[PDB]
Structure formats: C-alpha cells, structure tokens
C-alpha cells in the first residue's frame, strides 16, 4: 500500500518481545537452516543497518491506481466471479447473532478467548475476557457501545502491530524479515464476523475448484479430489506473488467488496461498509502511527477468504485483459490466500500475463524458479500448493499431500515449551505421507521420550478419511 502519513504520539504501543520457541532434540540432528524470527532490534543475529521498524513496513511501496477502463473490466470480472460464487453457495448471508459470532457455527470456528484484544484495550490493561463473555456468548458495555457506532457507521479504530513469533529461514531472519499480525480491536473482528461470518462458513463448507477456493479444506481427504480434477487438464501452472496481501490496491479492494457483498446477495448493508474500513488504515508501532492507503491488513477477520476471492478475480481479469472471449470455463483454479494452482487445455501464455497482473500492482513469477519464465506442459504432479506436493499413493492409487522433508525437519526442530507431545502427534499426520522410511527417520530423535504414532495406524486412518468405501472394500 501507500504510506500517506507517519507521526509520533505520546502513547507507546509495545511490540518487542521474547520468543517462546526453543530447540527440540531434533534440532541437533537435523541442523535446519531455520530459526525464530527476530522480535527485537537488539537481536545480535540481525545484519548491520537493519532497523526492524523499517523492514516491516518496507513492503508498502505505493497503491496502484487503475485506469477507468481497467476498473470497469475489474468490476465485470468481480461480478462474474460473484455470480458463480453465490450460484453455488446460495444467498443465506444474513448477519450472525452476537452469540453465533462469538461461539461460531458449522463451518466457522469460535472466536479466540485469550488472544490480543487490540487497541485501546491493550493500553488499558484489559484482556479479551474482560470485554466479552466467551462462555455465554455475550458482550460487556464497552463492546455494546462500539457495536452501536458500527451500526451507525461512525466507528473509528487503529491497528496494533504484533510481531509474529515463528520459525523462518535464517537468511530472512538476519535480514530482519519478521512477519507481522495487524491486530484489530476485538469488537471489529466480532462485527466483521456478524456481517459476513455466515458467508465465510458456507465458503469453507463448499471449498473446491468450482468456487476456486481451498479455504477450509482438509488436505488429507481433499488432495484426491483436487488431484483428480487438475490431472484432467493439458496445462497446469503454479504462480508465485511478491507481497500479495500488501499490494492489493484500493481500487481492487473497493470494487471487489462492492460486487461480492451486495444486499441483493443476502448481505446486510453494513457488510460492505465494515470490509471497506480495511482499505485505509492506521497502524500503531511503539510511539509511531503510520497511515496506509491500500493493502489487506494481516490477520484481520476473514483474511484468507478475502485474499482468495481477490486471487480468483485477478486471474479472470488478467486473462481477459490479454485475450478475447475468456470466461470462467476457459480455465480452472484453486487458491488459498496468495497460494494458487491454475489449469486449462488452452495453451495460455502466462509470461505475457505479467504486465496485466502489474496493472493491479501485483508481480507474478513461476513457483518453479528453475525457469525465469512460465512454460506449458506442467502437470498437477509438478506443483506445490499449501507447501504440499501431489503424489500418487501406490498402495491405494489416491493422491496424498507430501511435504518436503527439509520443511518437516525444520518444523520438528523447534517448539513452545510444554507442547512437544501434542506437536509431534500433529506433525505425524503430515509426515505419514512421506512414506515409511522417511517417517521413521524424522521421528527417530523423539523415540523413547515421547509417544510417536505407528506409521501403520496413521496410514489406515488416512485411507478411510480419503475414501470410506475403499477402506470397507479392503475387508471383503
């Protein structure tokens, strides 16, 4: 986005912290080229000249203003995608009750009871639980007051910059490439969920190529569904973006919000309004207040869904800006945020699409760097989606999500104190797909210290998850 103003204020919003990640027994064995991101400017690992503040906001290099002709085309694309989306999902998009927004509904998890509350609550020493009764699904006086301002469209707010405590490749760690979470006030998240939580739950429940979204999918069971679909096309491309979320221009955001969340599609008039509050935002970092025009805040409610919707419209837009007669059936795709897989029987020239994506402020390049240009002929077995490859399981003939061993090793090398056992059971679910031998090697360091699921048990669990009938047939 475009930083239009920077100012210093009296109130200091703390951002520096201590990492909660520590090495595990596997770290000494795998020696991963990864480490916890720097959470302080004083971190000795940072390179000379690295100012955490600056690096974090360096992604904002402008808000691309689209021509009248391009915005008209973009609206047509947004409306065409919206037509497909609501045709598949239906129009039961009315507001969620306060209780439902807090507790959740089928397809939408409940809100986090103890995560950051945002501003100005964090400066007042108030935690989320002091504002909302998460057990009974009710809100206190402070939130109630804020909701009234939102119903009247008079609500104002500032985002709290939060450093993401996570593992990253060391090269990025040293460069100070610590990612962030733009924490919005809890009442804002609550109201956003009230306005579009219904729609979000439905998108989760209907994930797939038809609506171009993988948000809410379960790789274990869905890779077979996604794999068989894409294996049917002549060409498959996996695209990479640079700062996808930060480079969404205000024109694209506003237009998308205007065409997708219309009252005629079952949404309350305030759904478009609350989403639009995300376009021009104020961010607090220590004593600084930075105003940014354009770009999607990080971690805001429905972030994955919004980014995925934009990704779908971007592809339709770019193809139509280059070719004539392009429609939704000209190609097929699936995306999760900035992650994306596109396919078509037509020999689409993605290299030529670069300038068209640039008109949106987005920079695309092939996911496969062993080629300074897009090529034809790739298949579903050559792409990576959600950090997973599409491999055929020889035992069943079903596709399974396989993660790179270097990635798994890195994941296994660090953990928050007291969570290792639970983390291992989770990663085991990801590692089973790498096969018996690699599975054994990856968990070898933990043997005897923690309970490691047998490869056999996880494989059987997976077969039934992907196809219950197949699991049953094996018993005739």
Automatic annotation (TrEMBL):
- List of residues binding UTP: 168, 179-180, 245, 298
Sequence ranges assigned to domain RdRp catalytic in this UniProt record: 234-352
Q: Where does Mg(2+) 4 bind?
A: 238, 339, 384
Query: Which amino acids does the record list as binding Mg(2+) 1?
Result: 115
Residues annotated for Mg(2+) 3 binding in this entry: 238, 339
What does the UniProt entry say about where the protein is found?
Host cytoplasmic vesicle membrane; Host endoplasmic reticulum membrane; Host nucleus; Virion
Residues the entry annotates as binding Mg(2+) 2: 238, 240, 339
Q: What does this protein do?
A: RNA-directed RNA polymerase 3D-POL replicates genomic and antigenomic RNA by recognizing replications specific signals. Covalently attaches UMP to a tyrosine of VPg, which is used to prime RNA synthesis. The positive stranded RNA genome is first replicated at virus induced membranous vesicles, creating a dsRNA genomic replication form. This dsRNA is then used as template to synthesize positive stranded RNA genomes. ss(+)RNA genomes are either translated, replicated or encapsidated.
Give the family per the record.
Belongs to the picornaviruses polyprotein family.
The record's subunit annotation is:
Interacts with RNA-dependent RNA polymerase; this interaction allows 3B-3 to act as a primer. Interacts (via R-G-D motif) with host ITGAV/ITGB6. Interacts with host MAVS; this interaction inhibits binding of host TRAF3 to MAVS, thereby suppressing interferon-mediated responses.
Question: Per its record, how is this protein called by name?
Answer: Genome polyprotein
Species, as recorded: Foot and mouth disease virus C
């Amino acid at each position: 986005g475009l930083i239009v103003d920077t100012r210093d204020v009296e109130e200091r919003v703390h951002v520096m912290r201590k990492t909660k990640l520590a090495p595990t027994v596997a770290h000494g064995v795998f020696n991963p080229e990864f480490g916890p991101a720097a959470l302080s400017n004083k971190d000795p690992r940072l390179n000379e000249g690295v100012v955490l503040d600056e690096v974090i906001f360096s992604k904002h290099k402008g808000d691309t203003k689209m021509s009248a002709e391009d915005k008209a085309l973009f609206r047509r694309c947004a409306a065409d995608y919206a037509s497909r989306l609501h045709s598949v999902l239906g129009t039961a998009n009315a507001p969620l009750s306060i209780y439902e927004a807090i507790k959740g509904v089928d397809g939408l998890d409940a809100m986090e009871p103890d995560t950051a509350p945002g501003l100005p609550w964090a400066l007042q020493g108030k935690r989320r639980g002091a504002l909302i009764d998460f057990e009974n699904g009710t809100v206190g006086p402070e939130v109630e007051a804020a909701l009234k301002l939102m119903e009247k469209r008079e609500y104002k707010f500032a985002c709290q910059t939060f450093l993401k405590d996570e593992i990253r490749p060391m090269e990025k760690v040293r460069a100070g490439k610590t990612r962030i979470v733009d924490v919005l006030p809890v009442e804002h998240i609550l109201y956003t969920r009230m306005m579009i939580g219904r729609f979000c739950a439905q998108m989760h429940s209907n994930n797939g190529p038809q609506i171009g979204s993988a948000v809410g999918c379960n790789p274990d069971v869905d890779w077979q569904r996604f794999g068989t679909h894409f294996a049917q096309y002549r060409n498959v491309w996996d695209v990479d973006y640079s700062a996808f979320d930060a480079n969404h221009c205000s024109d694209a955001m506003n237009i998308m919000f205007e065409e997708v969340f219309r009252t005629e599609f079952g949404f309350h008039p305030n759904a478009e309004w609350i989403l639009k509050t995300l376009v021009n935002t104020e961010h607090a970092y220590e004593n600084k207040r930075i105003t940014v025009e354009g770009g999607m805040p990080s971690g805001c409610s429905a972030t994955s869904i919004i980014n995925t919707i934009l990704n779908n419209i971007y592809v339709l837009y770019a193809l139509r800006r280059h070719y004539e007669g392009v429609e939704l059936d000209t190609y097929t795709m699936i995306s999760y945020g900035d992650d994306i897989v596109v396919a078509s029987d037509y020999d689409l020239d993605f290299e030529a699409l670069k300038p068209h994506f640039k008109s949106l402020g987005q920079t695309i390049t092939p996911a496969d760097k062993s080629d300074k240009g897009f090529v034809l002929g790739h298949s579903i077995t050559d792409v990576t989606f959600l950090k997973r490859h599409f491999h055929m399981d020889y035992g069943t003939g079903f596709y399974k999500p396989v993660m790179a061993s270097k990635t798994l090793e890195a994941i296994l090398s660090f953990a928050r104190r007291g969570t290792i056992q639970e983390k291992l059971i989770s990663v085991a679910g990801l590692a089973v797909h790498s096969g018996p031998d690699e599975y054994r090697r990856l968990f070898e360091p933990f043997q005897g210290l923690f309970e490691i699921p047998s490869y056999r048990s996880l494989y059987l669990r997976w077969v039934n998850a992907v196809c219950g009938d197949a699991a049953a047939l094996e018993h005739h």
